[PDB]
Design a protein around this ligand. Sequence first.
Ligand SMILES: NS(=O)(=O)c1nc2ccccc2[nH]1
Ligand SMILES: NS(=O)(=O)c1nc2ccccc2[nH]1
Ligand SMILES: NS(=O)(=O)c1nc2ccccc2[nH]1
Ligand SMILES: NS(=O)(=O)c1nc2ccccc2[nH]1
Lengths: 263, 265
Amino acid sequence: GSLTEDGLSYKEKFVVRSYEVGSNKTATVETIANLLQEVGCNHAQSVGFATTTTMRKLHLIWVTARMHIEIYKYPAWGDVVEIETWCQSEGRIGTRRDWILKDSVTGEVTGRATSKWVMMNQDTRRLQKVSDDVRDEYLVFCPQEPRLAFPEENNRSLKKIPKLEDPAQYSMIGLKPRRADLDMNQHVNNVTYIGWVLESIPQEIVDTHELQVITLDYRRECQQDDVVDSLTTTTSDSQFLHLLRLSGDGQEINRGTTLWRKK
Amino acid sequence: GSLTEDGLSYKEKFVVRSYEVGSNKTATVETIANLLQEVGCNHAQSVGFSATTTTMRKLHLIWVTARMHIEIYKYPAWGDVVEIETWCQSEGRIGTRRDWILKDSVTGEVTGRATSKWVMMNQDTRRLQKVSDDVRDEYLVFCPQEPRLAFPEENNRSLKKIPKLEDPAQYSMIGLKPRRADLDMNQHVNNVTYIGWVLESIPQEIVDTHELQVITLDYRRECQQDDVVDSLTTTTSNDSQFLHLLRLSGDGQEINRGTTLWRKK
Ligand SMILES: NS(=O)(=O)c1nc2ccccc2[nH]1
Ligand SMILES: NS(=O)(=O)c1nc2ccccc2[nH]1
Ligand SMILES: NS(=O)(=O)c1nc2ccccc2[nH]1
Ligand SMILES: NS(=O)(=O)c1nc2ccccc2[nH]1
């Protein structure tokens, strides 16, 4: 992988692996989300990091508030996918990381993704606005004119998501993370939550449809000793409303929506 | 990746990913096992497979793992390049063996080795059978004919008999179940998931103070998509050794048994 000519974005190519594909012999949405995360990490590394030196002193970190992914074509096993990523400052609200997925052979856009990030103290877990000091250190690595993976007005990446009401139409209960679900800092990897959301989608939908769009809001993290219930209700293509909550007290950890296209 | 000059083995390089590493910023044993599986798949593809031979597909026969043995001396760090060489060997009518050698691409030193025993099974009845001559002839042209062992040694750990853990277990992790990411393209539980489930009953204190050096796993029965598993461990022991058992949560039907050896950091 490498930074582009202007040094304001990063590209990397990936060969889709045998264990990364589902029943259709194409990459799962979890494989795609892991690849987006990997190219974001390589981008941060290439420009010197995604914590700045002043964030490290103040015990501040970037946390995902929302992830939105749209896939037109999932790459097949053995195919090469090229992913371009970049970051943008959204004033004192936080930052945004965007991605464009392309088929390396044709050059066509096969997918796009966007994510909203907020600044949090690692210890108290309290959200803070972005200070000028931190903003100035990040801006030299971002394009200053707008660059949006989802430019369109009233697009699906910025839609408000409601809270699923009991009883849910479908459910998968007692979900718990194992060591492979954790990142290097022993926190549950963000991609695991996408997997848990999808566990309450019936197998008949997965067998007859392809997932086209997924929007996920992250409210609270699942700890290593927590147990999660995944709830889904059809709102309609087929659209669903989703809710992840702790198995015991019913504390919300995530909410989202999915849109599926008939094969 | 590519077949070597003689066409009897296959090599591939991998850059260790951010999500593939544990707390030490080095690859997990599950990442290593996924990479071994990936290089085995690429080897089969390079020599014409899609690893079912012509006679196997008409007879509804497949290769299934009976045992997996992995020894790691050094886990590659995040961003490091690991080179893996793999090859197959016929073991007469018993079945086949796939071996691997892991190397640090910069130094060329051997950082790990693995071996696996495979048996022929009818896909539908699940009945094991010996390898026929017609099938054996079809895969011998892709294997070295003189012995080539990742584990040569006379009393090596890869061929040791594993006993059945007796109740009560010292440690346990109950109610483990697969999610869609744990399945392969054929909707069967991926073999690597079982390694993860075995490791779930190892205490976090062992994981924090030791590195896993050796793992031997016997596969007895598969976990179906609607099954629930209990992972059991008892210490059998500088180094710490454990005896492992995976069984179905309900009737206690054995699915796997194994051993692990851990060395103090
Ligand atoms: N909320 S989180 O993204 O799961 C998270 N919180 C964290 C605190 C310290 C270090 C890493 C963290 N990752
Ligand atoms: N973080 S976890 O993957 O949920 C986890 N923590 C563990 C501590 C001890 C034993 C098993 C464990 N599994
Ligand atoms: N026993 S197994 O390795 O989980 C397995 N059985 C199978 C039957 C048909 C197709 C793939 C399979 N994988
Ligand atoms: N155990 S699994 O094969 O990952 C799985 N999860 C499921 C959720 C809903 C319907 C069928 C499922 N199969």
